Swiss-Prot record:
Disulfide bonds join C76-C161, C154-C160. Homologous desensitization of the receptor is mediated by its phosphorylation by beta-adrenergic receptor kinase. Keywords: Cell membrane, Disulfide bond, Endosome, G-protein coupled receptor, Glycoprotein, Lipoprotein, Membrane, Palmitate, Phosphoprotein, Receptor, Transducer, Transmembrane, Transmembrane helix. This is Beta-1 adrenergic receptor. It is found in: Cell membrane; Early endosome. It is a multi-pass membrane protein. Residues 66-77, 142-167, 248-252 are extracellular. It comes from Meleagris gallopavo. GO terms for cellular component: early endosome; membrane; plasma membrane. The lineage of its organism: Eukaryota, Metazoa, Chordata, Craniata, Vertebrata. The keyword Cell membrane applies. Cyanopindolol binds at D83, S173, N261. The keyword Disulfide bond applies. Residues 30-38, 100-117 are cytoplasmic.
Amino acid sequence: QWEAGMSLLMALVVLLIVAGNVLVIAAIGSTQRLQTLTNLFITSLACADLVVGLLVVPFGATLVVRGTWLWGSFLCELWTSLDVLCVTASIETLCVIAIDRYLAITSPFRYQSLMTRARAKVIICTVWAISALVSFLPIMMHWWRDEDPQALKCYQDPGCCDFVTNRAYAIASSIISFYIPLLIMIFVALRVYREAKEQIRKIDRASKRKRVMLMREHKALKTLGIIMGVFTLCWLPFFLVNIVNVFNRDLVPDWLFVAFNWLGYANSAMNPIIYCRSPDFRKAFKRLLAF
Ligand SMILES: CC(C)(C)NC[C@H](O)COc1cccc2[nH]c(C#N)c(I)c12
């Protein structure tokens, strides 16, 4: 009856994710004070991370608990596609926010004259467009399938929903969906840690007006660096191992490959918790929870 002592932690984590992200969307949707530009991208994340809790985690939970896929050969690929999509759409939006805070911290004038709200919404959709094209289609077109006699065995089996992929895909799909966006995100997230350091460096002047607006605008930039940071810690392991197999299979235990995968799942619930650093958010979550 070990199944009962697991469905609790699983229903618990689904709760944290959903409740938490539904909260973050409401906090921004209600409070006009939280309806900033960057907080639109943050909304996108709250959605990607929500879809995970609502669909990706539930199904993925029954596959670990029962040890067998019970929802057919279709929902297998469909659940896989939503999974890959949500992770692609995330790293891309985090990569946007980096370039955003960069262009908004080095060209304050050009930024305001070019970056509106209706344009940033286009940006958000363009990201979800590329994410689908890149992750969703190649799966639908079965470019991931392997010719291995063992692999061909798992495709004809509806009860088996293992993501057995060839090595050509394994490499390209991980580069495109993760590594390239990650490197870009990291590089730019370091260029914004230098300018945001030189701004608080060449601040022996200013005032309790200009140092207060550099105390709020360095302070959010930290919360973003934490989001980008934690996210990397939860998904970089998984993708390192993912590549290891491409070079040398049977070197990493399958139980572990699933471990690091759930590590990256937990990352969806970690966001709303980190937003409690901001006084605004922290006050907005109390309004809704009826305190
Ligand atoms: C295997 C499964 C149970 C569904 N979990 C997949 C991960 O959530 C996401 O893994 C990825 C995310 C984004 C792009 C990716 N490319 C490849 C490959 N090869 C993977 I694995 C991958």
